[PDB]
Copies of this chain bind each other. A is one copy, B any other.
Amino acid sequence: LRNFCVFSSVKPLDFCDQYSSPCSSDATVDDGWFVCEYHASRFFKMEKLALAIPDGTGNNYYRTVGKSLVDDKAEGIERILIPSQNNYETVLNLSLLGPAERLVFYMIYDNKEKQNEICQQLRMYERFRPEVVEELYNSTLRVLALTNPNESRSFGLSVEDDLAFNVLPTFIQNLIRKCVAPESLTIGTEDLQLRNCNTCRITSEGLLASVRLYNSVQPKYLYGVNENRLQIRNVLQFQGNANALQQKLSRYELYQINIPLFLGKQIIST
């Protein structure tokens, strides 16, 4: 598979003489997410980060961790990172999306009736090109197949967290497992406390950025804005020169104020 993104198979059904998928350059690497950084940012509101664990000899074990794009001012469903099967249609706005993306989302969340309804309603597009549904269905199925199943992963000390996790679809479970790093990682015979505090939570509505931590990240795929419209809203600004703002302190190494997803514990077998 040259492109591992589950949304890479989405194409204009009407006419595709020359179309390029919007997947980013990371869609060609098998990091286990099966979602490119562009699509993850667009849908699940997160980016990818690499976490390196050293051993003592000079070898590094690498892991993926999600970086939350949710600001501290977001409320309600705006703080939901990955929606669950109970509210994915409302959170992702499936009615507004195109039929191909809607079918892909239905197949991801395992809605057989919706899958059949969309497939039967999409047959009239066969009159344009004879692979409107066949190749899309096959590609999505072969992408989802790779997600099917002494390392252990716990997502909280409470039973309700485990119940919320085990009712999610297999693709969603794999995405959450790959995007959420453990607070404490037991590797070999030693425990590494990556963080003593959590930043995300798993509930009946999916994976949410429950903690309202301050986020100062600049998205590299969601930075578009309409300059033609006039926006009138109060903000706060600083008065002073470099002495008052202490601009010289910028010469030091900057501490990034971001929100990586940390929750639960992980056991890595020998």
- A residues sitting closer than 8 Å to B (CB atoms) are 26, 29-31, 48-57, 59-65, 67, 72, 187-190, 192-197, 199, 211-214, 216, 227-241, 243-257, 260, 268-270
* Residue pair B234, A51 in contact (C-beta under 8 Å): no
Q: Which residues of B contact A227 (CB under 8 A)?
A: 239-241, 243-244
- A254 and B216: CB pair below 8 A? no
Cβ of A234 and Cβ of B62 under 8 Å apart?
Answer: no
Give min CB distance, A44 to chain B, whole Å. Answer: 16
Return the 6 tightest CB-CB contacts between A and B, nearest first: A197-B197, A56-B235, A62-B249, A231-B239, A50-B252, A57-B237
Whole-angstrom distance from the CB of A31 to the nearest CB of chain B?
Answer: 6
* Sample of 16 more A-B contacts, CB < 8 Å, known A67-B255, A227-B239, A231-B240: A49-B253, A50-B249, A51-B257, A52-B257, A57-B238, A59-B245, A61-B238, A61-B246, A63-B246, A188-B236, A227-B241, A227-B244, A228-B243, A229-B240, A232-B239, A233-B270
- Nearest residue (CB) in B for A241 is B227
The answer to whether B240 touches A237, judged by C-beta atoms less than 8 angstroms apart, is: no
Chain B residues, Cβ within 8 Å of A67: 255
Number of copies: 4
Q: Assess whether B270 is in contact with A48, with CB atoms less than 8 Å apart.
A: no
Chain B residues contacting A246 (CB-CB under 8 Å) are 61-63
* A190 neighbours in B (Cβ, 8 Å): 236
Could you say which residues of chain B place their CB within 8 Å of the CB of A229?
240, 244
Query: Chain B CB within 10 Å — which of A55, A192, A230 has the most?
Result: A230
Residues in B with CB closer than 8 Å to A54 are 216
**Known contacts A250-B52, A250-B60, A255-B65; is-contact A230 B234 (Cβ 8 Å):** no
Say yes or no: A214 contacts B193, CB within 8 Å. yes
A56/B189 in contact, CB under 8 A: no
**Distance between Cα atoms of A155 and B75 in the complex (Å):** 30
Nearest CB in chain B: distance from A51 CB, A? 5
Measured CA separation A196–B249 after assembly (Å): 25
B232–A268 CB distance below 8 A = yes
Residue numbers in B under 8 Å from A51 (CB-CB) = 254-255, 257
Whether A230 pairs with B239 at a CB distance below 8 angstroms is: yes
Complex partner residue of A56 from B228, B231, B236, CB under 8 angstroms: B236
CA distance A245 to B51 in the complex (A): 12
- Neighbouring B residues of A63 by C-beta, 8 Å: 246, 249
5 interchain pairs (CB within 8 A)? A26-B251, A52-B250, A62-B249, A193-B211, A256-B256
How far is it, in angstroms, between the C-alpha of A60 and the C-alpha of B249 when the chains are bound? 11
**Interface-centre pick from A26, A193, A239 (highest chain B CB count, 10 A):** A239
